[model samples]
Target: SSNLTEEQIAEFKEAFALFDKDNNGSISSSELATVMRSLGLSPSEAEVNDLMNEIDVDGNHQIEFSEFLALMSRQLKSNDSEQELLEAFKVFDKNGDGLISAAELKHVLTSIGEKLTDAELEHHHHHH
Candidate 1:
């Protein structure tokens, strides 16, 4: 049972509108597969079917707009929860030993398109 508010339902409808390419009033496994592919995930047909079954609350073999919205909302919430866990891990990595050296951090930053100076790297290490 989802505790979805009216506003959330509206938001979900909008999200579903964007994903339901065929406008069939329900989302099928193939439709969801396409959406996931667009997001850079290449799930097989069977995998897509399994995922749709897992998230479809109505047991109608297809996902309604509201159901898709509620499922996505839960996924987003889980992502946020994971972010908090990562932040907590950083916090618990005290003594700066868990953090890499300035050189290592700078290398990693540069790899990810960020150019942090040695001073900036040290600052981040100390602050975090």
Candidate 2:
């Protein structure tokens, strides 16, 4: 996510790697569930499944790095500050590829019941 210092990124990567036991570059629901249990949190299989469904944007049954970053960004507290706004933009970017396309913006806005016309979205995209 935007404004994440290198240290923070490294910290997240380290935590993610711990859960990505198979070294598949993604974390499976079971892996996450196991981590939760290790942390003394009893999470049901159904709860893990729901969490996976919510975080796995591509529905691949795994949480990729980008998805993990997005999840973490959502979990962190933000008060609409400049730094938070930048991170919010990164969350909408989803893939963390650095470009906020019209489709990505639309998806994020629509998810929150906010609508924007193509022209309007394009305008904001360009301006931002």
Candidate 3:
């Protein structure tokens, strides 16, 4: 929850409210299916049931806000981590060749204001 920004938290609440058609503080499978369809997803009954089971931690066959938030928070964290790693890989793959050479590594480090002498660069290339 702390990982989510205030804006994101508010957005999630608004989305949940939209799907909680009965204003019952929880979402049923039918409601979830409707929401999924609204988002252009065509989930099967089994898929819906599986998702509901995963999110309905209380075994009530409904999704509560806390469970929904936990799922969203985990997804956000995973996306953030993936994006960071991709950025770092891009930095180290200057030529976009899907490979990182010693020179590319040195270039990224030096571009980030980390000074590296010729000797240090050579040592790193050999050591690595």
Candidate 4:
């Protein structure tokens, strides 16, 4: 877990605790789905299923805190730096559009089984 230190683990544990709806020491697919929806992803069951298939280490059909942490660790390890992020944005803006619309974002995210919602779309537009 090169990407997560004890502090990061503690922070995430606190956050996940807020989302563990069933109080079963884990978050269900639906609970995680709600969080994703708030972020404008609005995942389908199949999308959640695929995520569980990839990250659910115990195969328990839900993501425990530890498994979630592991997933985050793996992902953060693979994450790009700010410069890399800029380069990637350039890659996505293949036409040098100088701005990314929901349609372009949809095309990009759909390829990875994700979708951008209005809030996220606006967030990226304003921030980037």
Task: Give me the candidate number with maximum TM-score.
Answer: 2
Which regions of candidate 2 deviate over 4 angstroms?
A: 5-7, 75-128
Between prediction 2 and prediction 4, the one with superior TM-score is 2
lDDT of 3 by residue, 69-99 (tens): 5553333433542222233234435455433
Where model 1 places Cα greater than 4 Å from the true spot, the runs are 1-3, 57-59, 72-128
Please rank every candidate by TM-score, starting with the best.
Answer: 2, 4, 1, 3
Over 4 Å off, model 4: 1-5, 75-128
Error of 2 at 78 (Å): 11
| lDDT tens digits, residue span 1-128, model 4 | 23456766666655555556666767767776776686555888777876666566667778766765554334333455222223323333445543333344434434333332233322354334
**Cα lDDT of all candidates, in order?**
0.49, 0.57, 0.54, 0.52
Better of 2 and 3 by TM-score: 2
lDDT of 3 at 18: 62
Candidate 2, pairs of clashing residues: none
Q: Candidate 3: list runs displaced more than 4 Å.
A: 1-11, 75-128
Model 1, span 5-116: residue lDDT tens: 6755654455456567877769888876786576545789887776676556655668876555433344343454222222212221233333322233223323432222
Ten residues in sequence with the least summed lDDT for candidate 4: 81-90
lDDT of 2 at 105: 44
